[PDB]
Amino acid sequence: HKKEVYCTVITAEPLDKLERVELTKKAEKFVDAGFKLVMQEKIDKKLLGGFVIEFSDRRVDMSTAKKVEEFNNFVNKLVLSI
Amino acid sequence: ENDVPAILKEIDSLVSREAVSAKEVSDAAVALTYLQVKANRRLWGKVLEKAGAAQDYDAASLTNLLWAINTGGVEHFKTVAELAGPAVSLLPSLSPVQLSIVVEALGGAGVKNYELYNKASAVVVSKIGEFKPAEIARVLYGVAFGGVNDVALAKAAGKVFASTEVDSRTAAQALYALAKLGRADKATVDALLKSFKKGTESASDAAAASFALGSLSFKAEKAIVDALKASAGDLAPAQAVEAAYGLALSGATDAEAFKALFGVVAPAIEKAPDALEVSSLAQLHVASTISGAKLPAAVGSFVAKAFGLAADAARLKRSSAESALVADVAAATAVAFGAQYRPEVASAVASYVKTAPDGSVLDIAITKGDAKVLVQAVPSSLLTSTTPAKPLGHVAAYSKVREAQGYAVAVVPANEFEALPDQKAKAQYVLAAIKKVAPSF
Amino acid sequence: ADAKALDELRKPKFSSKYLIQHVSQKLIPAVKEWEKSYQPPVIHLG
Amino acid sequence: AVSKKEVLYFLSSKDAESSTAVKSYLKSLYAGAQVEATETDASELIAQLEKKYLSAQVVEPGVHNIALPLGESGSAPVKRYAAELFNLGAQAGFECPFIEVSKKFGQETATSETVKDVLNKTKSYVSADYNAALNEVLSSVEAEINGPVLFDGKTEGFKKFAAKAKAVAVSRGLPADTILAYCAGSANEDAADKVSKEFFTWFESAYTADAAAEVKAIEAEAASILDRHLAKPVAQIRKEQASAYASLLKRAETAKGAKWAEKYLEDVKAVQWFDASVAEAPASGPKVAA
Amino acid sequence: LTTFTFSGLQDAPVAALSGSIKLNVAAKAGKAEVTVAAGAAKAATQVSAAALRKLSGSKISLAEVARISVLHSSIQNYLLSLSNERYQLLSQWPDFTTMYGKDFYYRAHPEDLKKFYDAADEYYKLYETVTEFDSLSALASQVVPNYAARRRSTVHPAIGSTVADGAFTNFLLSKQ
Secondary structure, three states: OOOOEEEEEEOOOOHHHHHHHHHHHHHHHOOOOOOOEEEEEEEEOOOOEEEEEEEOOOOEEOOOOHHHHHHHHHHHHHHHOO | OOOOHHHHHHHHHHOOOOOOOHHHHHHHHHHHHHHOOOHHHHHHHHHHHHHHOOOOOOHHHHHHHHHHHHOOOEHHHHHHHHHHHHHHHHHHHOHHHHHHHHHHHHHOOOOOOHHHHHHHHHHHHHHHOOOOOOHHHHHHHHHOOOOOOOOOHHHHHHHHHHHOOOHHHHHHHHHHHHHOOOOOOOOHHHHHHHHHHHOOOHHHHHHHHHHHHHOOOOOOHHHHHHHHHHHHOOOOHHHHHHHHHHHHOOOOHHHHHHHHHHHHHHHHHHHHOOOOOHHHHHHHHHHHHHHHHHHHHHHHHHHHHHHHHHHHHHOOOHHHHHHHHHHHHHHHHHHOOOOOHHHHHHHHHHOEEEEEOOOOOOOOEEEEEOEEEEEEEEOOOHHHOOOOOOHHHHHHHHHHHHOOOOOOOEEEEEEHHHOOHHHOOOOHHHHHHHHOOOOOO | OOEEEHHOOOOOOOOOOOHHHHHHHHHHHHHHHHHHHOOOOOOEEE | OOOOHHHHHOOOOOOOOHHHHHHHHHHHHHHHHOOOOOOOOHHHHHHHHHHHHHHHHHHHHHHOOOOOOOOOOHHHHHHHHHHHHHHHHHHHHOOOOOHHHHHHHHHOOOOEEEHHHHHOOOOOOOOHHHHHHHHHHHHHHHHOOOOOEEOOOHHHHHHHHHHHHHHHHHHHOOOOOHHHHHHHHHOOOHHHHHHHHHHHHHHHHHHHHHHHHHHHHHHHHHHHHHHHHHOHHHHHHHHHHHHHHHHHHHHHHOOOOOOOHHHHHHHHHHHHHHHHHHHHHHOOOOOOOO | OOOOOOEEEEOOOOOOOOOOOHHHHHHHHEEEEEEOOOOOEEEEEEEEEEHHHOOOOEEEEEEOOOOOOOOHHHHEEEEEEEEHHHHHHHHHOHHHHHHOOOHHHHHOOOHHHHHHHHHHHHHHHHHHHHHOOHHHHHHHHHOOHHHHHOOOOOOOOOOHHHHHHHHHHHHOOOOO
């Protein structure tokens, strides 16, 4: 009924408030509609940067550790393909 | 009775044999140096091949062959660097003059033999009274250009150069060694400059002393710039580049010496632009910019483009500590200009990366209207190795050449910036430097 | 052409330098367009 | 030609074809061509991959220009070989090997809170003997404190692990006090000079030992290859090498338009030129235009 | 070699050390007369200190002219030295052809004689395969690539086990 979805956002560092509003505007595009987003902040320093949004239904891994791992896998698949 | 191709033919038949001992190779190299053989490269190749193959080296043949290699201008790193084995095995058997010549040749060639330079520096500082000042100047030049930052030998040599009067060639060699070591002592360099009053035996001595004064951010001697003005034609174009570069870095205003040096080096680029290294053409652009003396227009545009190339090449192959320092100084510059949140800091740091007019990349370049500020982070590699730790002459060189492109250059050294405990104090330091250089920002 | 210059004769013959240059020229723009087209997928937990 | 990043990596090089490319670029600039603006873009991951491949393009011809000191007496040919590899790494944009592998240790375990994750993520760069000894030390310290040792550096468990690790490092031959005091620095420059001389004694011994180990491996491989070669009759050797040469030419001639295959066939032609130039005059050697 | 060199007539050699070539210099104030004699050839010139200082202004960069590469030539030279060692042990072989006569044929057991002739053919095979020196270059091409793959390290071309072990001591025994 009410357009509220609960999520857990995990970052490497404690959030700045401009970082908070930019992350909120980034994470409002993963929800279905103009839903209000009630996030909970956590800290994981194994994440190097970015964020991991943990919904109950789904996961969005926009961390930089997942990015460099996808980078290394893509580079390895190209240099073994060539 | 007097035939130089015939004696070269006999030397070539001597070094083409099946078994040539080290005495014969040493004598062939010494004769090739005394005959001043530069056009016959294959004869020097045969001599260096037989020098590499020779296995019975005593003190005299090793010393004479290393003298001949160092004096003839013959560089082949494999043979000379494998000649360090005879040097280490004969180092107790060497006299002070022979140890001097051997360490000078193996250091000027660039041999990375830490055991050789450590044992030689231990020999020299162990008995410093047995060595006369030309010998400790050659050993200091050897351990300096062999990659050893031996400050015990530099202190002992500075004590001797303050106590004993030296020749101008000895002082120029010692200044060149201290300029590679990055030691801007005022006790030693003042003695080595007061020795530069009896004239110069060679123009390469005055050129090396001028380059060494410009590197250590001293001011030019009038005798050195006068000896460079008198005999500028005795230099190679790369030596003329380093002479004019050290004169411009030292702050000399003698337009006649710069005119002579540029008239030496500028037809060499017109004959072959690709003859000199790009670092030498960048040094020529620095000298032409700071001195203000002109060049030919094609030569001036070419050395401007080559300065852009050399700055870009020094930025691409930059050390990682210098990259971290540039990132830290850029973050402090972003915080000093009104960024208290991490995305604002990252966006400002990425916005500071701008393209120079000569095609190179400036890391921290802020513009306001028509005013430009270039924050220049200086790593510890470009600082003076002595305990005051000032930036070297190349830092002021880059500052003056960027100022000629209309950039107010704020110099941020590594020690002063990394002395601060937090980012707010670092932003205060960077903002104080920018306000000291350009108060409009 | 029976005599060659020293700068032509100094180079080693069978090095993998042009293989590395070819792999770099095929790898760098492709990984650039991967970098500009990067979007992390939405992983469903279950 | 070059993509203008290649020429910037080849400015400080001493390799032959890179120097001819740099010289032709400088002649083109003296002709009056404008220098292309260097790119002020690319992400850190994209920039580091380009740097890796450009440094490989500098290292690969320069490795082939270095004579291996095979079957030599004395430490000076091995020191020449190590010095040439050092200067080649400096020409390709690397720092000192000590600093460059310390970068790898700091990069691979930048986010590691325990010592076991450090020993498992830097496993490729540390010897298996030293890694196993440090793992036994870590298991002993985790047994005595009944807790995982953390990588903070101020806990007492890490201090006990660091004491026993300094013990095993001294036992394996590494003067860990000298290595620590060199990277830590000193207040006066004289004590720093003493520590630096002891460190560079260790460091020269270390890279001489690694280069001598590489030379011994190449020597043993060449002796093994020659023994299995000399076990054969002559005709089998001739047909095997002719078949391998024909297959390599067929692999190079399958690719047309590739730069590497064009350079491969040009180098085959230059080897044939070398053989013809030696055949014209065997006592003088190859004809060098001078 | 560096840009400025400071060696010349100052501490120069005055005499040759071998009898194959004779050197006599006469060093006056800033100048010298050199006489070099080898065989029937003699040369007597006059060299200043400034000329010897000008001599190292232009560098002679001596460089190897190799068939394939300096690395390949070093590997092939080591293969040639090992083939020389096997050639020595094959040259210490006994002369079996001194026992090819019919008296040695008919005094001998027939199976021992066939063993002897097979041993002679085995020597001819070994000597023909050790003198196949033109194969050695191809053997060098079997050593070059893998070694080169060890030199294309992502850390450094000159990194080894001991340097990385000492750097790991510095990394671990320091905090974080």
